[PDB]
Amino acid sequence: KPVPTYVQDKDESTLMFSVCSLVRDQAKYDRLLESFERFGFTPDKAEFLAADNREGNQFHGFSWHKQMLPRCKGRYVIFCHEDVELVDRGYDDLVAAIEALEEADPKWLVAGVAGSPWRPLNHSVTAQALHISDVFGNDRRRGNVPCRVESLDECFLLMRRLKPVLNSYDMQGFHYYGADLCLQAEFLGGRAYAIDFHLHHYGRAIADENFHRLRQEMAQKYRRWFPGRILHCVTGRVALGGGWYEAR
Amino acid sequence: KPVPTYVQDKDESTLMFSVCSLVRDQAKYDRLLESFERFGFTPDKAEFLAADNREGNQFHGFSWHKQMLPRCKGRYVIFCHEDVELVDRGYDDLVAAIEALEEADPKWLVAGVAGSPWRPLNHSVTAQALHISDVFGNDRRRGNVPCRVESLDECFLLMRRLKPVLNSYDMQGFHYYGADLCLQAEFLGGRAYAIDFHLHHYGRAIADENFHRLRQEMAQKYRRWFPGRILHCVTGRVALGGGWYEAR
Ligand SMILES: O=c1ccn([C@@H]2O[C@H](COP(=O)(O)OP(=O)(O)O)[C@@H](O)[C@H]2O)c(=O)[nH]1
Ligand SMILES: [Mn+2]
Ligand SMILES: [Mn+2]
C-alpha cells in the first residue's frame, strides 16, 4: 500500500546559488542583497535565505547551516555574513572560479575567499591566503589564491548542496566555525580552498572572552586527533598541543 | 530588490518518519513497505523514499544519504536496507525508544538496532549489542540494549533530519558505512546508540572481496586519528594500527 518516491543520482537544481546569511542588522543585510542583485545574482540564478538573528541569537555559527540546508534549492550554497557586499566581481566570476576549482581539484568540499594555507611549514608567522577589501585595506592580498587551506574566514564560504559538510555539535558561538568546517571536511575525506573572488567585508573581529574560550575549546577538541598540530587561522595560530608536544 | 526568506529555529515537520531504503530488488522492497504500513507507518505518520539501485549501482552505502536527506520532510530519517521487515514492534514502539533515548542522552546523533558497545575493554572477543531476528537466529540478543556503541549494523539506522551526520566521501561501496557514520558522529561531538527495536533482517552474510577491501581502507583512513584503536563491529574487530602499535 505505501507509494514510495524513487530517487535518482541527478542534480535537479535549476538555481545556481542559495545565498544564506546570518542576519542581525537589517540595514547591513539590505546592503548585501542590493549588491548581490546588482552583480548578477538575479531571481533566475539565486535565492536568498536568512537565519533570523534580528531579535536575538536564535542561531550561532555552528548551528545555523543545519536549519538552512534543508530549505535550499540551489546547486551551491553560500553561507556568508550580513556585512559582505559585492563590489566588482559577480555571479559569472564566482561560477567561473568554482568550475575552475572543480577541474583543478574535484576533492574540494568547502571554498571561501580568505583563509590559511594547508599545513604551513613555517609556524613562526601566521599563514594567510586571501583577496578581499576589508578594514585592513581595499583590494588587498596575502599569499596566492586559489589555494588549499586548513581554515577559512567565516565572512563567506560555500559548498555544494549535494556534497555538504557539517559543523560540530559540541561547540557554540561566533568564532572558529570556519576552521571547524574545514577540519570536518578533512575528516570526510575532502578539502577546503580559498578561491579568488574579491568582495568587500565590513566587519571587525572581536577578540573577546568567547573568542578565547572557543580557541581553548578548539584546541581541547582537535588535539585528540591532530596532536602537536599548529592550526593557522586568519585570526592567529592555535597550537593544539596533545601527544608528544606536551613534553617540556 | 531580492525578497529573502527568514528562517526561524523551529521543527516544522508534520511527518514523524522519512523511511529511506537502498533498493535493488523490487520484491524485497514491496515486502518491506507492506510490513511498515502493517505495523503503524501510515501516510499520516511516514513517507517512504528509495535510493534507486534497481537498474545499477547508482548509489552506494557512503553516498546515498546526501541525495535522500534533501527530499525528506520527516522529523527522523531512517536509512535501511530493502531486506528488513517489521514483524512485531512498530511505529509506537520506535517513537517510544527514540523519545527514551533523547531523555537518557541528548548527545545521541545516530541510533540503530545492532552494533558494538563503545570502547570495549575486552578485545579478545567481538563486542556486540543487539536484538533482532536475522540469519543467525529469530528473536536473538547480544549484550544489553539500549546502549552507546562505536559502530552500527547498516541494515537499519536513523538520525534526526535537523541534526544529521554524514558518511565520508573518500570511501565507496557496501560495507562499513555504519561504522563510518558512527565515527563521524564522534568527530562532530555526538554519540551513537543501539536501541531496542526488534525487526527481521533477512540478508545473508554472503561474503565478497569488497568487504576485505573496505576493512583495509577503513583501517588506513581511521588509524590517522585513532592510532592503536581496535574498532569493534558486529562483523568482527578491526585493529586500526598506527602510532605506537606499529612497534613489533
Ligand atoms: O551491489 C550491490 C549490493 C548491495 N546493494 C544494496 O546494499 C544493501 C545491502 O545489501 P544486502 O541487503 O543484499 O546485503 P546483506 O544484508 O545480505 O549483507 C541493500 O540495500 C542492497 O539493496 C546494492 O545496491 N548494490
Ligand atoms: Mn562580518
Ligand atoms: Mn540486508
From Swiss-Prot, chains A, B:
It comes from the Bacteria. InterPro entries: Nucleotide-diphossugar_trans. This is ATP synthase subunits region ORF 6. It comes from Fuscovulum blasticum (Rhodobacter blasticus).
